[PDB]
Symmetry: C3
Amino acid sequence: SNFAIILAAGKGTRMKSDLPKVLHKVAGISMLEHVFRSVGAIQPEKTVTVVGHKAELVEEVLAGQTEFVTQSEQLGTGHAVMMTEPILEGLSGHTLVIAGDTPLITGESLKNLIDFHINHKNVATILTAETDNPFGYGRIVVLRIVEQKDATDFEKQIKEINTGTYVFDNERLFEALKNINTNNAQGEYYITDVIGIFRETGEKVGAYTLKDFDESLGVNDRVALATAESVMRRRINHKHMVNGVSFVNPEATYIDIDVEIAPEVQIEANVILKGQTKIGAETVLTNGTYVVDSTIGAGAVITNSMIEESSVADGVTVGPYAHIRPNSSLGAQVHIGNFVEVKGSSIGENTKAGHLTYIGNCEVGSNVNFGAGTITVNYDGKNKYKTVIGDNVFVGSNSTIIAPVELGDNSLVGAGSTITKDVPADAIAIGRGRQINKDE
Amino acid sequence: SNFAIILAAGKGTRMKSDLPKVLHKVAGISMLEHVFRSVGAIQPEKTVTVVGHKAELVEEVLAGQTEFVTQSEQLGTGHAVMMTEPILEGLSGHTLVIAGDTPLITGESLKNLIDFHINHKNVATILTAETDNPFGYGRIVVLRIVEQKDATDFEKQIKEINTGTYVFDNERLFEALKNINTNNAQGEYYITDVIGIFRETGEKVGAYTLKDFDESLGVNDRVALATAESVMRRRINHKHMVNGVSFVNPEATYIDIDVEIAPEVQIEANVILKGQTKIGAETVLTNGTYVVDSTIGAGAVITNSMIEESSVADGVTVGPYAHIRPNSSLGAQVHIGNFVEVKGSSIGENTKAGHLTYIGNCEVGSNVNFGAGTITVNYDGKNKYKTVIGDNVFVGSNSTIIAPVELGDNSLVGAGSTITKDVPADAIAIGRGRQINKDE
Amino acid sequence: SNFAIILAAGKGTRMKSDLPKVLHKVAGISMLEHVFRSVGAIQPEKTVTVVGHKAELVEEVLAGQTEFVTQSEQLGTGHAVMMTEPILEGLSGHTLVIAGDTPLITGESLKNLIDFHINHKNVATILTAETDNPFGYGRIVVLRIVEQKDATDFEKQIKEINTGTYVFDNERLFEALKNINTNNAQGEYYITDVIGIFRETGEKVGAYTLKDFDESLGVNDRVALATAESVMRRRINHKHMVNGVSFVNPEATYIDIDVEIAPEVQIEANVILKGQTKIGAETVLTNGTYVVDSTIGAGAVITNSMIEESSVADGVTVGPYAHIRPNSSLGAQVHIGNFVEVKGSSIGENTKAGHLTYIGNCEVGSNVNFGAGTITVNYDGKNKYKTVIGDNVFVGSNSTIIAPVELGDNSLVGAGSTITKDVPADAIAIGRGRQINKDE
Ligand SMILES: [Ca+2]
Ligand SMILES: [Ca+2]
Ligand SMILES: [Ca+2]
Ligand SMILES: [Ca+2]
């Protein structure tokens, strides 16, 4: 009963990019994916995306749930939708035609668009909006969509404009296109021509007006791309605020569309949350914090730090200026202070690494203490090695732990030491020279 | 002659918080405290705050200057103000009734509110404002405050709305409430009912209209809380700019309400100043700088750094990426470079710690030089120790100074050394091994 | 044929600064320089800047291309322009009179201003604009410029105001001033008085209206200075976006007026680019990145780092939290990780310094590897020294390389070592003590 056609064929030269226009991201995902998500709201029985230049590229990612069709020749929107003929020809119902570059339209508006369509038995309904600066846009007279050039000194005053989003009765849509194309006397034909045909035939043409004009934004250049990110950012942050998350400045906090955040979390300005990130209850995120594809538990405090593809338990304190790199896990109540880098290591609960430390490829136990300046070495030039540090070990400041090596439970390393051999449990490893003063 | 009643009883379920609503902060202090500060402007002979859930909590901080009264049962604003009867009953004068959730109202407006009250001998004056979207708010007809539901197809057009802030003649206020409550035929009664009673009795009811509608904002959820921080931020930064402080972007700089800043200071965007912080003349604060409960002198340059509960003299340069922790003091012209952490230490003038260094619990003299990579160790596992470093000492790069220990004036430590014993004045301490090459 | 007079004499007491008002910067250069750049658009045969207090200071920088004249006495704008008499007296043509504190006016508007001037043969044309809050500004009746005080209950309604920018026929301009000054019966005389004289004489006085009122902004205090930076920031970022640069938030990115950025560059919010900075194609700049007077190549990724007066080749990755200091050069595909400081050193291609490292005054070859914690020492107290590190050298973690010293190609340093003597090619230098365990 409901069908959807997504127009996603290049031609976006104002973007000054080699990437297909619809692949440019907005709050974490491509414009095309935001459009697929809105389209899902109408629960279309079938969906077809017309692609073009770098066709496979657009398919080489956001594929699967959707049928694709390629157009090797660009002859306008009419032609583009004509390329979906092989799949929608004959079926009865309602067909939504939408551009892959209008990422701000919501599922709720698409739905209101169809409802209106049916509630008036229209043959075609134009999604429209009102602006005080109609310049350029096609004007809505419903009788006909007058273009800017073909507009009369009078018509150039119509506030209501065409958003380029439509709903047509599937049977008549392909008919009109088939017709226009042959008796067009021109090469390229636009989808708005079909609106012209229903005018001739006296068929019913409705128009749904959007409440918010800004949701109709079509992205043609990077100025409109930034505007899209601005609206999407406000939308995302608004939902988080209604859900109990505090923002010092929601106009300057950057949270991707799929990030999950528990109520009571507090977010200072200029925090960045990307990908599949998740934040537990009562966690505090301070200015400069940057988190990507990670999980942060409840009661944590992340201070001006960078966390990537890692997991952080409840009550962890990180920062300021720490870097938690891929595949690290920080156990409950762990503390990572300033200028510490943790990479590919698991760290047991209550362990502390408060300063200028590098921990890579280690399995670390609980209640371990890393003195300021501790460095793990697990790279020789071609191969890496792992290090095991037991529970309750004390690693003196400015030490160098050279892997492969193991430190047993409760062992201790003296400051300034260089460890090259296993240190047994309860032992004490020292590898530093003796001090020698010299008067005058 | 002037009395004030502050309504601060829970019921804020849209906040999704376990903290009493009025305790949520805006620019450094609770909404309740911003309201107390505005209220002080009318110089009320007596002030009473009606609290409720977590009553003690609200008292367990912002107490002292104000009388509190608890309401174990929530039966509306009428009931809430009725709880202050034991204290304001009988007194003559003017009584301001204000919610603890309207933190943007200024003392100047409260004052204009009273003046208006007296200048018209009103019995009650409603603080009002005009908006183009009156939906939801009580409409002002002065005759009566028509609610959204009880509003006629006509009345729902009144632009002027009720802010919920009022001034009543104290004697008649408690009378009407006492009355309504008994012949109410209902449990809960609203303070706006008193406006209804004065209508019956034909008493004079005025209305003061605020010039700025946004100052009337009542905070019910975290979206309005962010709006309150946005307005308060602009207000605070505006005053600093009029006072000679330059801001690269005052819409994105976060300065708490009590921070003091001398004229000629320059502030880049995204700087955060909290608590009792004070900044001296001509100081430059760059992007990312975060200062809490600290004092910074004149002529300093703080570059992307974090400073907490410390004192910084004139001409100090800090950063980028340095962390000055609690109870540290940096003398005149001291320089702390990148990746340096200073914790609980005093540092004499002209001393320099330019790179990757950790200085904790030390008393440091003047003209000292910390080579890159120097680490102080004053933690054994259960106990801490102090270190004294005299004037003009040179601490070679990558050294480890293990406390307790002392370095005498003009002494010197060789790079890569580990110091465990006192180093006498003018001496030279070395604790590093010898280098051994190996051909091929 | 075209002449220009720039009014830049102090009197800006609301700025609370000891610097001449026009010297305050906006997006990297003084307000005066933005005005010179707009003025150049009219291609003036001669340009004269009237200075005053700290006269030399204004000349001690933005000099050269312009004639200066000092006024030791402040008797108004009429007097100020009278000081340029010695140079413009007698010449025929058109003379633009503009204040050094209106940095937002564009060259395109100045040009439209002259065109209008000539297209109407006016004797004088007032650059005007319309605002809904004319309060304070001089009203435009063209007949006369009525001031706020001398305005009639009616005139105080004129929406069109005087921007203080004018074009006069050079011959008549000095005539009227010469006249007014003698029969003024007052000390100070304003340039708007000349508009009064042409009214008496019945001469033609036109007015060009600006499309954007905000471009007329005169900066008198730091609140308007921030507004100027806000408009200039939007203008600069807009041009970059039209040119192919992506901005996550162009309202919070700080790019100086002369920074050059190649298309396809991606810029996260809160990035700062200053001075003569240049960014190559497809480079990614993340939140917190701060670049000053540097060149970054194509395909680089700068993550939250500070780069000053340096050069960075193609494919370099820097950050997070690295500091590249003055006079450093990073070769192609070099990698500088977190907490690394590079100062005055050249670094060959593919070299890697991934953690907690300080590299100063070194010449480093290609394919070198700096293990975490490596420190170069080239400071003794009064003198500095250089270090040469050949190609393919491996510098073990936590080492100390003490200059002057040299490491030959393919040599290697063992971790925890202190190097004080040259290390020959293919050799292996070790300077660490031996580890000694201790049971229980
Ligand atoms: Ca274990
Ligand atoms: Ca001393
Ligand atoms: Ca070579
Ligand atoms: Ca070290």
